[PDB]
Amino acid sequence: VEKQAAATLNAWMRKDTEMTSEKKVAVAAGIGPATVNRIMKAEVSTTIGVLSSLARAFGHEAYEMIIPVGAPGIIDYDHRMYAALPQEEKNKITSFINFVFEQNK
Amino acid sequence: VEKQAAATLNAWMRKDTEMTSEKKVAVAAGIGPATVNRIMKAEVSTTIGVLSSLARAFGHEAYEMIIPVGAPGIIDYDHRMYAALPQEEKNKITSFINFVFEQNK
Amino acid sequence: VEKQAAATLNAWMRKDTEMTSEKKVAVAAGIGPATVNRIMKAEVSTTIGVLSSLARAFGHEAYEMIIPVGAPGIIDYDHRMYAALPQEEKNKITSFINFVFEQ
Amino acid sequence: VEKQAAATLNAWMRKDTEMTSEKKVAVAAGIGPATVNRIMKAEVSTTIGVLSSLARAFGHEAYEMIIPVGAPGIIDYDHRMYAALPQEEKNKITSFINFVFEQNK
């Protein structure tokens, strides 16, 4: 979980135009230069708030960083395209998903 | 985020799929009974460590408790129950998503 | 082919408001000489005009008479509620079905 | 509603599956030659015999012609595609049956 957050945070750090900097991530996130480090070494178990501040600096949200590899549970798509659709169309997907689910129960 | 954590905790309490009662949540998480409330009211920004332990106490992962459910770009569905599907059933769900999209785009 | 549709007429005529006399069904049809007995025997190939006036009193539309007995293309369902369920959410059905066409 | 079968036949001119270029019309049923003038509408009150042998030729049957397209209480689907395509997958639609949760239900 911490160790997920570490890799995610490092992987984004190895990518991104700001290059890599515990300083720049601290600067972008608005937390101290020494806390990033403690988080990136998976030494301290950080707060969700601080997690949020971190994901946002890269253009992401907190949960995204604490997702288990393989990502069981997650689906492939373009989010605007999904968000841009009528509400009545959405409950089609919710109705379908759980149909499948409880078909198996 | 903390407000997402609180919303889903109660949302997960509204569920009662595995849960015998309201009370036992603290030792399942194995942290003080003040803590569960402080989280449920978004008084404190909880560490991802405890967040794992609260979530693992129910049978979900941490990320599901701070997922921005409501976000229009994000389909509300149960990630554990999708994870459990035979990939044939998963491909079919994916197959529908594109269906709607390409119907609407 | 045209015959079992007569057996449906004879099946229905046994329960409605007018479950006995041929003539009350003839005026339910609105037309026809003493002939309208002939539709019961599959002697005549009854016109699609007859179904209508016949139907409006029944509460049955016309397809239910000319449906092949073993029709594979027919869905099993309670039309207790279908269009009766909201149209926002009846839209799901049509989309699922069409979804299966593309498959 | 009742003359729906007359338009439904006129609606079939987009099919073009058997014969790709300009040709006679359709000699399959052994129905009238004037039927071409007729087919569209303003026709004849057709027999059951008529539609059944035209429908037989294309792979359709009697009842499907005269079901309403516009009526509120009719589930719109192609019975022959409900027949023809694998009915090992369409048993789901039959298991799906009412499916409706009390939201729909």
How far apart are the C-alpha atoms of C43 and C39, rounded to whole Å?
6
Residue positions counted in chain B: 105
Are residues B53 and B30 in contact, defined by beta-carbon separation less than 8 angstroms?
Answer: yes
Q: What's the alpha-carbon Rg for chain D, to the nearest Å? A: 17
When CB atoms are compared, the residue of B1, B74, B100 closest to A48 is B1
Q: What is the CATH number of the domain that holds D24?
A: 1.10.260.40
Using a CB–CB cut-off of 8 Å, the residues of A that contact C are 88, 91-92, 95-96
| Angle subtended at Cα C79 by Cα C75 and Cα C82, rounded to the nearest 5 degrees | 95
Burial of D52 (0-12, 13-18, 19+ CB in 10 A): buried
Residues β-bridged to residue C2: none
- Resolution at which this structure was determined, Å: 3.0
Structure tokens at A94: 């919710």
Structure tokens at D29: 């049923």
By three-state DSSP, how is residue B3 classified?
Answer: helix
Give the DSSP letter string of C61-73. -GGGTS--TT-TT
B13 half-sphere exposure, CB direction, 13 A CA radius? 14
How far apart are the C-alpha atoms of A33 and A23, rounded to whole Å?
5
How far apart are the C-alpha atoms of D28 and C62, rounded to whole Å?
25
How far apart are the C-alpha atoms of B36 and B45, rounded to whole Å?
12
How far apart are the C-alpha atoms of A91 and C86, rounded to whole Å?
13
Experimental technique, in short, is X-ray
Residue positions counted in chain C: 103
Q: Which residues, at least 6 apart from B38, have a Cβ–Cβ distance to it below 8 Å?
A: B44
Using a CB–CB cut-off of 8 Å, the residues of D that contact C are 2, 5, 45-49, 52, 61-64, 66-68, 71-83, 85, 87, 89-90, 93-94, 96-98, 100, 103-105
Neighboring chain C residues of B99 at a CB cutoff of 8 Å: 95, 99, 102
- How many angstroms from the chain centroid is the CA of residue B88? 24
Structure tokens at D41: 């509408």
By three-state DSSP, how is residue D104 classified?
Answer: coil
For B26, phi and psi rounded to 5 degrees? -75, -45
- Residue D78's CB is within 10 A of a number of other CB atoms, namely 15
Give the DSSP letter string of C84-99. TS-HHHHHHHHHHHHH
Q: Which of B89, B97, B103, B104 to mutate to test the interface with C (most CBs of C within 10 A)?
A: B103
Are residues A82 and B83 in contact, defined by beta-carbon separation less than 8 angstroms?
Answer: no
Note whether D94 contacts C76, CB cutoff 8 Å. Answer: yes
- Neighbors of chain B with 3 or more C-beta pairs under 8 Å: A, C
Tracing tokens 């338009």 back to the chain, one arrives at: D7
Structure tokens at B26: 């603290």
Q: Which residues, at least 6 apart from D83, have a Cβ–Cβ distance to it below 8 Å?
A: C71, C72, C73
Shortest distance between the Cα of D13 and any Cα of chain C, in A, equals: 21
Note whether D94 contacts C84, CB cutoff 8 Å. Answer: no
How far apart are the C-alpha atoms of C52 and C60, rounded to whole Å?
9
What is the extent of the structural domain holding B13? 1-70
Residue among C59, C41, C58, C50 nearest C5 (CA): C41
Are residues C72 and D78 in contact, defined by beta-carbon separation less than 8 angstroms?
Answer: no
How far apart are the C-alpha atoms of A16 and A14, rounded to whole Å?
7
How far apart are the C-alpha atoms of B24 and D23, rounded to whole Å?
79
By three-state DSSP, how is residue A47 classified?
Answer: strand
How far apart are the C-alpha atoms of A18 and A68, rounded to whole Å?
26
Are residues C50 and C32 in contact, defined by beta-carbon separation less than 8 angstroms?
Answer: yes
By three-state DSSP, how is residue B52 classified?
Answer: helix
Tracing tokens 């300083």 back to the chain, one arrives at: A23
* Residue of chain A nearest C87, judged by CA positions: A88
